[PDB]
Structure formats: C-alpha cells, structure tokens
JSON list of N, CA and C in Angstrom, two decimals:
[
{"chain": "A", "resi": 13, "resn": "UNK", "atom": "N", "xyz": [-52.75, -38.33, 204.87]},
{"chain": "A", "resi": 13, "resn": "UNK", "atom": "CA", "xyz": [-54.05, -37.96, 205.50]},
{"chain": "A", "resi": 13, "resn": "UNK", "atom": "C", "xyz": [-54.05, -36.46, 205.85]},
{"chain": "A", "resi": 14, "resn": "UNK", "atom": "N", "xyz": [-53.42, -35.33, 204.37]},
{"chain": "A", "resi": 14, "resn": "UNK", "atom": "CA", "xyz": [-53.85, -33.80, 205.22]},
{"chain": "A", "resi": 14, "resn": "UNK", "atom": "C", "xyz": [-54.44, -33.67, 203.90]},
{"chain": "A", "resi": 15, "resn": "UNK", "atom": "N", "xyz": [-55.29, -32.36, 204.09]},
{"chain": "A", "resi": 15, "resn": "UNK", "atom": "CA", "xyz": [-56.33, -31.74, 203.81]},
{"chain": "A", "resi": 15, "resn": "UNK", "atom": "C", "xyz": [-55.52, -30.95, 202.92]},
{"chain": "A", "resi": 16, "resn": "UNK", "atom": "N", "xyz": [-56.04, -30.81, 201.04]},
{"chain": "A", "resi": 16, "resn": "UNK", "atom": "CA", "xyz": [-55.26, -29.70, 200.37]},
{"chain": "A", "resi": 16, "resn": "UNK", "atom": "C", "xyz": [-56.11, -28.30, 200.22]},
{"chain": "A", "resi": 17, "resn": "UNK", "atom": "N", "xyz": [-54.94, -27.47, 200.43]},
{"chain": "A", "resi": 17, "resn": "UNK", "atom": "CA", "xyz": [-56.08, -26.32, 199.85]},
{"chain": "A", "resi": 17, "resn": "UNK", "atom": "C", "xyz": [-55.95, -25.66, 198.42]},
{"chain": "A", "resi": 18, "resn": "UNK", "atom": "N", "xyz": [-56.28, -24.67, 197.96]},
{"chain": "A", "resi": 18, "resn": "UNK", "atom": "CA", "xyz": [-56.65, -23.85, 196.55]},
{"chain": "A", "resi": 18, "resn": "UNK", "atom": "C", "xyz": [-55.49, -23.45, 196.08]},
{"chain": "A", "resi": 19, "resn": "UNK", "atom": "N", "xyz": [-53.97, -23.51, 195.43]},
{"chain": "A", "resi": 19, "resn": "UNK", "atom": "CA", "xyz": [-52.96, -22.80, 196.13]},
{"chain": "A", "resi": 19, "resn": "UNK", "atom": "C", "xyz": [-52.81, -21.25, 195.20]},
{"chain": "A", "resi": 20, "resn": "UNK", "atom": "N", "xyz": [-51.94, -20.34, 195.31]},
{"chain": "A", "resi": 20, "resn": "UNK", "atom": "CA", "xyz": [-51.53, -19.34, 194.47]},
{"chain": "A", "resi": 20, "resn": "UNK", "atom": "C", "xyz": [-51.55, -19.49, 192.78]},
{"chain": "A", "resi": 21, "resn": "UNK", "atom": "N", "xyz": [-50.65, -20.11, 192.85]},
{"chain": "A", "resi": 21, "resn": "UNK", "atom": "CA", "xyz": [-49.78, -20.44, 191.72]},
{"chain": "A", "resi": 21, "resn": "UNK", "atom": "C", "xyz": [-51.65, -21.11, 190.43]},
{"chain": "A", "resi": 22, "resn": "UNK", "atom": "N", "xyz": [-52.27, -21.66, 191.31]},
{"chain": "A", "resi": 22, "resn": "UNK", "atom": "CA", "xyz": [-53.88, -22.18, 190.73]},
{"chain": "A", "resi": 22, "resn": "UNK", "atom": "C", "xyz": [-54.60, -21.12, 190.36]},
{"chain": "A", "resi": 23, "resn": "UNK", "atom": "N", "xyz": [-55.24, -20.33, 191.24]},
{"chain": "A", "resi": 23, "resn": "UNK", "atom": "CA", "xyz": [-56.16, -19.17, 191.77]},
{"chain": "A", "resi": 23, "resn": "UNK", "atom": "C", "xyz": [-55.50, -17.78, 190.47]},
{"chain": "A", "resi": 24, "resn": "UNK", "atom": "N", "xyz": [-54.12, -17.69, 190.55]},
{"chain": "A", "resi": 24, "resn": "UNK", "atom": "CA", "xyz": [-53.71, -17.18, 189.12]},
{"chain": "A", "resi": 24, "resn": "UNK", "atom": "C", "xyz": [-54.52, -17.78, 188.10]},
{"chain": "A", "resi": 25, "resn": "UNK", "atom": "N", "xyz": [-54.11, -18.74, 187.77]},
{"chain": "A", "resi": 25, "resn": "UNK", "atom": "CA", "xyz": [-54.26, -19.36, 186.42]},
{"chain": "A", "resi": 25, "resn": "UNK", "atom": "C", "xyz": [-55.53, -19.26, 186.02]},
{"chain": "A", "resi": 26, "resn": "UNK", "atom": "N", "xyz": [-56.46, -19.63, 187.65]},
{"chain": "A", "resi": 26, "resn": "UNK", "atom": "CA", "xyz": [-57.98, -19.55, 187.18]},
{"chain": "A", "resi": 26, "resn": "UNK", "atom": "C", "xyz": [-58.98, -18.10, 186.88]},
{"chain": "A", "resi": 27, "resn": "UNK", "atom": "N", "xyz": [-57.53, -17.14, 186.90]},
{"chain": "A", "resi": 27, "resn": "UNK", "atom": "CA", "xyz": [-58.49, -15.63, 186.82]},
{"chain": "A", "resi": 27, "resn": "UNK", "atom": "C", "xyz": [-58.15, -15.54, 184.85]},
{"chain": "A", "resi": 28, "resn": "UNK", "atom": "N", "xyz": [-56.57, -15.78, 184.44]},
{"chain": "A", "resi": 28, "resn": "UNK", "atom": "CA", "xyz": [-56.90, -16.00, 183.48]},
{"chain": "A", "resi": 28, "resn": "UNK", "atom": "C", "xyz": [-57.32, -16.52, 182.31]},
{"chain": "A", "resi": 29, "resn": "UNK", "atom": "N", "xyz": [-57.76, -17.66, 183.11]},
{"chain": "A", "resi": 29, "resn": "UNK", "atom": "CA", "xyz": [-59.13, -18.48, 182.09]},
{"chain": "A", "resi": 29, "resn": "UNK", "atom": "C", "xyz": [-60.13, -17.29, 181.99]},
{"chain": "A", "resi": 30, "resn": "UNK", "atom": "N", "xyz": [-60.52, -16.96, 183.15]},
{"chain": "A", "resi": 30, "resn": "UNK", "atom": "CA", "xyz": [-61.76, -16.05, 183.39]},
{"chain": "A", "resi": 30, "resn": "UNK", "atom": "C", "xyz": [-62.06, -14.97, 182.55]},
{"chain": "A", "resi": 31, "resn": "UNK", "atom": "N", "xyz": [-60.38, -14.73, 181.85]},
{"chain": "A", "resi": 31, "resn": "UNK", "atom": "CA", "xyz": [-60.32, -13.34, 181.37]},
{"chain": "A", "resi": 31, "resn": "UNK", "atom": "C", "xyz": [-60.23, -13.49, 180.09]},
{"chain": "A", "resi": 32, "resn": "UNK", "atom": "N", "xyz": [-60.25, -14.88, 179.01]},
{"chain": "A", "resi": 32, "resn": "UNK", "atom": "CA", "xyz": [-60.70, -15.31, 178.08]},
{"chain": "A", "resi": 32, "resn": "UNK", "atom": "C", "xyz": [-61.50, -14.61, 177.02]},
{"chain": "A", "resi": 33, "resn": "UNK", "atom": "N", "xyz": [-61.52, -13.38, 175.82]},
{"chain": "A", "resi": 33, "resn": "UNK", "atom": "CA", "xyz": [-62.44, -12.58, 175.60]},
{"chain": "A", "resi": 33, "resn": "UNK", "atom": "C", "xyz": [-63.27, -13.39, 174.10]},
{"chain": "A", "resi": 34, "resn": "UNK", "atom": "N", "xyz": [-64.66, -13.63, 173.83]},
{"chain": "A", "resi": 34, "resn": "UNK", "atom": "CA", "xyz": [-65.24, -13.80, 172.95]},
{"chain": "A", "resi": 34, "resn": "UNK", "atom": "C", "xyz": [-65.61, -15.38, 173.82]},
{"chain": "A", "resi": 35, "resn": "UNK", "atom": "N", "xyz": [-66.25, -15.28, 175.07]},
{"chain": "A", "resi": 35, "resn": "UNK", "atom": "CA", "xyz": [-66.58, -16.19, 175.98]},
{"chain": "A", "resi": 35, "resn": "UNK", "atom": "C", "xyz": [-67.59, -17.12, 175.04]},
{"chain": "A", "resi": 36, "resn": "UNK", "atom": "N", "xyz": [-66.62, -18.85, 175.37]},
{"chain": "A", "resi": 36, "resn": "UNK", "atom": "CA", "xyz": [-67.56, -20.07, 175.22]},
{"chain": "A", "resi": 36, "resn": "UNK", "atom": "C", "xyz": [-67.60, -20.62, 176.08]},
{"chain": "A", "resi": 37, "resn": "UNK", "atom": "N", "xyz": [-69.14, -20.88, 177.04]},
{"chain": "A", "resi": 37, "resn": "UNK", "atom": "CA", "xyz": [-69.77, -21.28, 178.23]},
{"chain": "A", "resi": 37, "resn": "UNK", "atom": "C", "xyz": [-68.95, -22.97, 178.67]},
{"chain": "A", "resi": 38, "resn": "UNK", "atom": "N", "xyz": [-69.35, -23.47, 177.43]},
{"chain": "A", "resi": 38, "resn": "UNK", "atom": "CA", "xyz": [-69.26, -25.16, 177.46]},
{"chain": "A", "resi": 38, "resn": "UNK", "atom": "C", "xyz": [-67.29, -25.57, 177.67]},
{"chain": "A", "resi": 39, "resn": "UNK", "atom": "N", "xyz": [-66.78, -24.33, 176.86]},
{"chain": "A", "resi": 39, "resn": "UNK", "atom": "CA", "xyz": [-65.30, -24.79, 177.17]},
{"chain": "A", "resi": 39, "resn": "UNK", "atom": "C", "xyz": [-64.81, -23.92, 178.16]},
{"chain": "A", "resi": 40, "resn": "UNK", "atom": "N", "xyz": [-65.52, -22.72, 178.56]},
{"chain": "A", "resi": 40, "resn": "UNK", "atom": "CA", "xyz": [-65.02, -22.08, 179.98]},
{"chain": "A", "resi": 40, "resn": "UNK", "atom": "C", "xyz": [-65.28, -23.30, 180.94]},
{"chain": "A", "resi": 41, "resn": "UNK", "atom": "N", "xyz": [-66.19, -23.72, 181.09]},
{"chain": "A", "resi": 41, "resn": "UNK", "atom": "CA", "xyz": [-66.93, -24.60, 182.33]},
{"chain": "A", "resi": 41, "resn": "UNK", "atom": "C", "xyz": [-65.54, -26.14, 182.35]},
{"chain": "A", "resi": 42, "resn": "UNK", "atom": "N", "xyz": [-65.77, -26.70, 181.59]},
{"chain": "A", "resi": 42, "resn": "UNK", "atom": "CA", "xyz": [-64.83, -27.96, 180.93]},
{"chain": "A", "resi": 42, "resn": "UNK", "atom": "C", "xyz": [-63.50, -27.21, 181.76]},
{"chain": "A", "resi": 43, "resn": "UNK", "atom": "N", "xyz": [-62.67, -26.07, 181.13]},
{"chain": "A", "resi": 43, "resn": "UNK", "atom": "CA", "xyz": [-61.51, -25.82, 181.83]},
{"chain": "A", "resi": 43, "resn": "UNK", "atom": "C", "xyz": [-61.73, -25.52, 183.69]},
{"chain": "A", "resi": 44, "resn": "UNK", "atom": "N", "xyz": [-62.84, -24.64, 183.88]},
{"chain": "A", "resi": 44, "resn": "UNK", "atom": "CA", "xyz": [-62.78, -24.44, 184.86]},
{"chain": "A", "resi": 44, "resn": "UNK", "atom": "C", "xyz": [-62.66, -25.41, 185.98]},
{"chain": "A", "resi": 45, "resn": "UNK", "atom": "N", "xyz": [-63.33, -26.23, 185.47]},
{"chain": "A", "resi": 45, "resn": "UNK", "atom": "CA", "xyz": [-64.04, -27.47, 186.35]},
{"chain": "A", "resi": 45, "resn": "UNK", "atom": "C", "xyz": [-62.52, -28.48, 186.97]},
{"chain": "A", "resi": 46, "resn": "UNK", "atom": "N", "xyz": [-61.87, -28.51, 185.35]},
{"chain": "A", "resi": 46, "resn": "UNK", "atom": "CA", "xyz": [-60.58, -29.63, 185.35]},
{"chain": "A", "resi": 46, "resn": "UNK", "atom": "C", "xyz": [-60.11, -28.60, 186.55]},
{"chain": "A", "resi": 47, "resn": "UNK", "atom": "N", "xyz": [-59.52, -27.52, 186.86]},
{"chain": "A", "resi": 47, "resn": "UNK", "atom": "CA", "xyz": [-59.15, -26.27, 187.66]},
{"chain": "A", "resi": 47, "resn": "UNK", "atom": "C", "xyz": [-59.62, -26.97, 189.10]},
{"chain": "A", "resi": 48, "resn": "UNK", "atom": "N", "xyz": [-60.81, -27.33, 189.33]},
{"chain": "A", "resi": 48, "resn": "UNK", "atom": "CA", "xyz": [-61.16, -27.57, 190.24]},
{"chain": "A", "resi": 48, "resn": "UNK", "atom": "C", "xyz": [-61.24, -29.24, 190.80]},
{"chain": "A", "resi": 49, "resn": "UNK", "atom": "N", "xyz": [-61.20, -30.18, 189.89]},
{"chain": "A", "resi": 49, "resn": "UNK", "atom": "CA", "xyz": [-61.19, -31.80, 190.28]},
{"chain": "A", "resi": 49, "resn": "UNK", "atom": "C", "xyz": [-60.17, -32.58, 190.82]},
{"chain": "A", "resi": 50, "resn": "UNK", "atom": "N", "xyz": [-59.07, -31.55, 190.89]},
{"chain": "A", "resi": 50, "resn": "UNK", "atom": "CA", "xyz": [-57.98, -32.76, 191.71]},
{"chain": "A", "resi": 50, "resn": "UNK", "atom": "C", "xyz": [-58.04, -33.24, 192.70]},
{"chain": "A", "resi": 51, "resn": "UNK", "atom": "N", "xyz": [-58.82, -32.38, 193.70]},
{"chain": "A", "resi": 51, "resn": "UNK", "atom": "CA", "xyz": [-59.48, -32.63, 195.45]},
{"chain": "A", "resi": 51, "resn": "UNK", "atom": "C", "xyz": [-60.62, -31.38, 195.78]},
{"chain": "A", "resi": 52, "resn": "UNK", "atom": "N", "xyz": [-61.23, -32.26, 196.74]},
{"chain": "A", "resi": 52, "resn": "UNK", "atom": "CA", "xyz": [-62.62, -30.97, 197.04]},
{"chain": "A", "resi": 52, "resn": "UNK", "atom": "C", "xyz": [-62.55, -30.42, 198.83]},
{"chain": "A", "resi": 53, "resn": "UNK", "atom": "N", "xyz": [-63.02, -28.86, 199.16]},
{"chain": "A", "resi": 53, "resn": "UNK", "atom": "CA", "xyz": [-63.29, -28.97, 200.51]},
{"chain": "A", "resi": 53, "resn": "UNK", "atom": "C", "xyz": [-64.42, -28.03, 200.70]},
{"chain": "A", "resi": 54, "resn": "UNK", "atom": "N", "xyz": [-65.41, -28.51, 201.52]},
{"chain": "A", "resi": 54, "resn": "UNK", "atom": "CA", "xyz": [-66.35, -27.08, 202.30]},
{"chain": "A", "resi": 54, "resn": "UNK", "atom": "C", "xyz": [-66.06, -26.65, 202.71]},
{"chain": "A", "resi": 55, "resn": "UNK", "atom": "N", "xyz": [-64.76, -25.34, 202.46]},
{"chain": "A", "resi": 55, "resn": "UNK", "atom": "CA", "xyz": [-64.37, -25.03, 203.82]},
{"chain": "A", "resi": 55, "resn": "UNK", "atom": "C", "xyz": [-65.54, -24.17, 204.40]},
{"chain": "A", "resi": 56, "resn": "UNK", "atom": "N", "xyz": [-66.79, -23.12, 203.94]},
{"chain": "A", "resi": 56, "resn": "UNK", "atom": "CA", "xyz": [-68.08, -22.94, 204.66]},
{"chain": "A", "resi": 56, "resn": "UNK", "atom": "C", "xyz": [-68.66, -23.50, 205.32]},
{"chain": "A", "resi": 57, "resn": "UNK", "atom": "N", "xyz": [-68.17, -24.77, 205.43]},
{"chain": "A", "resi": 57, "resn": "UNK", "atom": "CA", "xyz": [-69.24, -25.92, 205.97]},
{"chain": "A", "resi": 57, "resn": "UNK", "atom": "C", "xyz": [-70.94, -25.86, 206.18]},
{"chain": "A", "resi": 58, "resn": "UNK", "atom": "N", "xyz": [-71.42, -25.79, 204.99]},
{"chain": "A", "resi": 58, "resn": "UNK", "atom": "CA", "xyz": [-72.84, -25.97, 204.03]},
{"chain": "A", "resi": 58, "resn": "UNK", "atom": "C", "xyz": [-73.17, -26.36, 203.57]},
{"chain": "A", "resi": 59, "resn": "UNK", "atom": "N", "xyz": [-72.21, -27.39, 203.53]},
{"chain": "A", "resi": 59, "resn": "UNK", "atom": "CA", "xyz": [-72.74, -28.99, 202.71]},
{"chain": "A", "resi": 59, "resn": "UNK", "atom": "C", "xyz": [-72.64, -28.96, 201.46]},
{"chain": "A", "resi": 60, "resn": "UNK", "atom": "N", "xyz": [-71.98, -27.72, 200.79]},
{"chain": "A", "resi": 60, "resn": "UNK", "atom": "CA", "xyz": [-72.01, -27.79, 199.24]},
{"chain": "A", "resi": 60, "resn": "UNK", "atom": "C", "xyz": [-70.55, -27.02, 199.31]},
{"chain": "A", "resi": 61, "resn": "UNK", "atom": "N", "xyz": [-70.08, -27.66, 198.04]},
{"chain": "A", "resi": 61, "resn": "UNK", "atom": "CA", "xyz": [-68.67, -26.96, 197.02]},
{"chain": "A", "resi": 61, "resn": "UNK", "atom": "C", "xyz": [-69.49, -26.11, 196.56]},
{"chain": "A", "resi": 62, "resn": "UNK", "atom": "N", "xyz": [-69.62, -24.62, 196.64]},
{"chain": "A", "resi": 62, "resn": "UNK", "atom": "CA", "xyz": [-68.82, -23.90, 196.04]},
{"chain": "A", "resi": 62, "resn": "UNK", "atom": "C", "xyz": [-68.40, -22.16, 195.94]},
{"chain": "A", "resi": 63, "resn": "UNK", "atom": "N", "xyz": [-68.39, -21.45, 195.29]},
{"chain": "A", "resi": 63, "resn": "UNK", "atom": "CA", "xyz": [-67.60, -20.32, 194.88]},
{"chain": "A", "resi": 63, "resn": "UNK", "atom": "C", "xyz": [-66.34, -20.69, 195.19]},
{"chain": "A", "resi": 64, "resn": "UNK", "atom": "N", "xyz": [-65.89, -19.97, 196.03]},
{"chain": "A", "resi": 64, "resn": "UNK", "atom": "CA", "xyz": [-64.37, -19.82, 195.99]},
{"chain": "A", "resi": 64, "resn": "UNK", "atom": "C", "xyz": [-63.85, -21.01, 196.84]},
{"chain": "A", "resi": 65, "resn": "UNK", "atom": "N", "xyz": [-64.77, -22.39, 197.07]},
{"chain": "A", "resi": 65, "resn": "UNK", "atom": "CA", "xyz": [-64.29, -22.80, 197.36]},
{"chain": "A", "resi": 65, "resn": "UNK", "atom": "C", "xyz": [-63.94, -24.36, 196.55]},
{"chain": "A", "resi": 66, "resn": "UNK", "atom": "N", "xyz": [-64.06, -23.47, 194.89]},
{"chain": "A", "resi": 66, "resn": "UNK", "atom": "CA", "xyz": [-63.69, -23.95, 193.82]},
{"chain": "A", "resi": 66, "resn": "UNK", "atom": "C", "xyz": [-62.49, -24.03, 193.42]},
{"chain": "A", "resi": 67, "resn": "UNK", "atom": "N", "xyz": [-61.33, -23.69, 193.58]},
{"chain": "A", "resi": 67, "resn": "UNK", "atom": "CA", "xyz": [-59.81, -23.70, 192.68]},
{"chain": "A", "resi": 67, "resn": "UNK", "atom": "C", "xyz": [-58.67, -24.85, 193.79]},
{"chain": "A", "resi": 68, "resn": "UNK", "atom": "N", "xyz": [-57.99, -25.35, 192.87]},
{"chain": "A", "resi": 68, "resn": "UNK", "atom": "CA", "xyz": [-56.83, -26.22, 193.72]},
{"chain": "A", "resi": 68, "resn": "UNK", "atom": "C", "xyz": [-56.25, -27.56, 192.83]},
{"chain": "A", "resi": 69, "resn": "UNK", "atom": "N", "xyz": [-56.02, -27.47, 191.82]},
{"chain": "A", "resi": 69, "resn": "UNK", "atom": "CA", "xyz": [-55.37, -28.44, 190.35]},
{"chain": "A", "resi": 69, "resn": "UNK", "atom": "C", "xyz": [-53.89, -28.19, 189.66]},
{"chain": "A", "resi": 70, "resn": "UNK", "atom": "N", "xyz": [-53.20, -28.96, 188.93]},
{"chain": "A", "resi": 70, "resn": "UNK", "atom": "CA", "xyz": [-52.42, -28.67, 188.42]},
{"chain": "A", "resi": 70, "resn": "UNK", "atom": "C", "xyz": [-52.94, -27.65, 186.70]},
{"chain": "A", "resi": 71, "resn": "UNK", "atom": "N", "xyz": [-52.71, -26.46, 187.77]},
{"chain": "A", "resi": 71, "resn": "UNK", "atom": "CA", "xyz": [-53.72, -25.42, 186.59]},
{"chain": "A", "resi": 71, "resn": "UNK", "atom": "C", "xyz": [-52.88, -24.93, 185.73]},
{"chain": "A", "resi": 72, "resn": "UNK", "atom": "N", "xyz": [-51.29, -25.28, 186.12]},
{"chain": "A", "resi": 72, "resn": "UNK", "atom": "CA", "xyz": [-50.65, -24.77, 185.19]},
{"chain": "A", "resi": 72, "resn": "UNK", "atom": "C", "xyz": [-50.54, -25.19, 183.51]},
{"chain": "A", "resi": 73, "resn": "UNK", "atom": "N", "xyz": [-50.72, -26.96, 183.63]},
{"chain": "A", "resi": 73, "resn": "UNK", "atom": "CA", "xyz": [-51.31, -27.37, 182.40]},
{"chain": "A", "resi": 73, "resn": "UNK", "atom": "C", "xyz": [-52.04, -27.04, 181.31]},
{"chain": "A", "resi": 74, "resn": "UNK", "atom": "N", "xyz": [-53.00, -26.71, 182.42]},
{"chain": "A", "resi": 74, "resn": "UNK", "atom": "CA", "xyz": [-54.48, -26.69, 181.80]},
{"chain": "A", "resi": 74, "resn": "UNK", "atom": "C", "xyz": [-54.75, -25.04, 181.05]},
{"chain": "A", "resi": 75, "resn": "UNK", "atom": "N", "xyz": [-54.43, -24.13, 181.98]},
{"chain": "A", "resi": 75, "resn": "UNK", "atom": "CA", "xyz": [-54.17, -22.54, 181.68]},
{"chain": "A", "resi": 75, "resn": "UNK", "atom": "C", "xyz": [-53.32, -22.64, 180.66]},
{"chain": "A", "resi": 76, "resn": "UNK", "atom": "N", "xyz": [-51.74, -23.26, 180.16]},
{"chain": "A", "resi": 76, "resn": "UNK", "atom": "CA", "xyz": [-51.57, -23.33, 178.77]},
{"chain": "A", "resi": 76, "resn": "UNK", "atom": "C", "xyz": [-52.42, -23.60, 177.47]},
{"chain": "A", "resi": 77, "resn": "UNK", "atom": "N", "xyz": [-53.33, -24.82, 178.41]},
{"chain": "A", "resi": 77, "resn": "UNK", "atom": "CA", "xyz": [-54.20, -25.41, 177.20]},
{"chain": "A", "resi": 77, "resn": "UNK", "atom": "C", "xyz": [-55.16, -24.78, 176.88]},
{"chain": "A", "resi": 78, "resn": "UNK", "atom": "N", "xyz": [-56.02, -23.99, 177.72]},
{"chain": "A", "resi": 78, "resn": "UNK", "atom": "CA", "xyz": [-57.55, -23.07, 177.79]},
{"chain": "A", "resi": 78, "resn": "UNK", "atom": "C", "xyz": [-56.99, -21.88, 176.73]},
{"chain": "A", "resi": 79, "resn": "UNK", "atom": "N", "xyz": [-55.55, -21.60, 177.09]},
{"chain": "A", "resi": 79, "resn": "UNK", "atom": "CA", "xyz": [-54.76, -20.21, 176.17]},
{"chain": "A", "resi": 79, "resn": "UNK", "atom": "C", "xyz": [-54.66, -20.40, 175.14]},
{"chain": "A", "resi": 80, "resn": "UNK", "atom": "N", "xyz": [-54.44, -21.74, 174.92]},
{"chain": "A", "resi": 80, "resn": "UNK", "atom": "CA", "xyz": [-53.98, -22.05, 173.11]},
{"chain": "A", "resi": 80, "resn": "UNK", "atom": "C", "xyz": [-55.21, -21.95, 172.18]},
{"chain": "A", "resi": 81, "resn": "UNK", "atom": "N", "xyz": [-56.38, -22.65, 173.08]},
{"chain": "A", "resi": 81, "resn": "UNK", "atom": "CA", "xyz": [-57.25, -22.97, 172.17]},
{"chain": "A", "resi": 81, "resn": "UNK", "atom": "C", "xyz": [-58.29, -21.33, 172.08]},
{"chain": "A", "resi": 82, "resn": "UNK", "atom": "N", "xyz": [-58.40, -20.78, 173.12]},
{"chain": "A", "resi": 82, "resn": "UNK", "atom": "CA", "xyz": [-59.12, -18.95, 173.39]},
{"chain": "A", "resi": 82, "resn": "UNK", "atom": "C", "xyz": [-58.23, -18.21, 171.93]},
{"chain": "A", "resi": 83, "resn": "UNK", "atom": "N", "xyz": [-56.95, -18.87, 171.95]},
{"chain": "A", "resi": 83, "resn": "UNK", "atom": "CA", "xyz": [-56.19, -18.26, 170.72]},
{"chain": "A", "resi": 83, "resn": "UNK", "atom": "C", "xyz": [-56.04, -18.52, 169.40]},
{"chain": "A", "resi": 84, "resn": "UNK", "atom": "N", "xyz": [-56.44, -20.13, 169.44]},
{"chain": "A", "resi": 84, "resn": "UNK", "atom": "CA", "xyz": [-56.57, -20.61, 168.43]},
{"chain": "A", "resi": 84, "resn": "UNK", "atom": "C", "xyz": [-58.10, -21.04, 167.74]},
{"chain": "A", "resi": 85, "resn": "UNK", "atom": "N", "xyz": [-58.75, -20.84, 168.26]},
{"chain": "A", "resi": 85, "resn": "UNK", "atom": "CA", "xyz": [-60.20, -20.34, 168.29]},
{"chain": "A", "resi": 85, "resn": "UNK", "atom": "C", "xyz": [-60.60, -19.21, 168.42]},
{"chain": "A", "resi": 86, "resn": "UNK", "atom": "N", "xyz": [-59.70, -18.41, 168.29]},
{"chain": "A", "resi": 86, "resn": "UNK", "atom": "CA", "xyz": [-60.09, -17.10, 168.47]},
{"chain": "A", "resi": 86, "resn": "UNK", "atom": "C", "xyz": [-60.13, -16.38, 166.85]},
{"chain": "A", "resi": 87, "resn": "UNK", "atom": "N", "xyz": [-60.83, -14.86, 166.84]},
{"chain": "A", "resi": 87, "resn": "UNK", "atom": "CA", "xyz": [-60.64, -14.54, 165.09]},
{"chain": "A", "resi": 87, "resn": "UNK", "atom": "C", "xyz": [-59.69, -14.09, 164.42]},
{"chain": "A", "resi": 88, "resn": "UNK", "atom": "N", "xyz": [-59.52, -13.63, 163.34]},
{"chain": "A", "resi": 88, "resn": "UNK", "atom": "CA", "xyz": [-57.98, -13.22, 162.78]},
{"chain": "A", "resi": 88, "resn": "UNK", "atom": "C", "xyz": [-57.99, -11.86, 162.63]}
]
C-alpha cells in the first residue's frame, strides 16, 4: 500500500525516445504511453494525469525496443 513515483533510471529513457529523429506520432505515442502504464499519480492534484506527471515503467525494456525499431525503420 505505497504510492510509486516516476524514477531516474525511466525519465532517462523517456527523453531518449523523445529524441528519436524522422518522428512517427502513432509509434512515439504507443512507446511513450507503455513508459507511462505501469502505475498512475496526480501529483497536481487536478483531477487529470498529465505532463510530467507522465513517466514511471520498466522503460528500460521498452527504450531498447523504441531504439531498435527508430533504427530499424530508420533510412540507409
């Protein structure tokens, strides 16, 4: 029963998704999102998720996976 927050090691990972060059909306969003679904908090308390109070996942996964494909989808 405690409360998680956003951690380091995440908040990395999620700048370099961000930094992804020859940007696709539908698979930025898809990674970002997984980045963000493991647990939620307001910490603003405004009744809504979000900006920064978006990141907190096992992003290390996922930041391999967003990399492979930015690379492997990427041009030659």
């Amino acid at each position: 029963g405690v409360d998680n927050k956003f951690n380091k090691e995440q908040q990395n990972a999620f700048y370099e998704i961000l930094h992804l060059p020859n940007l696709n909306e539908e698979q930025r969003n898809a990674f970002i999102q997984s980045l963000k679904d493991d647990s939620y908090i307001d910490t603003n308390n405004d009744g809504a998720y979000e900006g920064d109070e978006l990141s907190g996942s096992q992003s290390a996964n996922l930041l391999a996976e967003a990399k492979k494909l930015n690379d492997a989808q990427a041009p030659k």
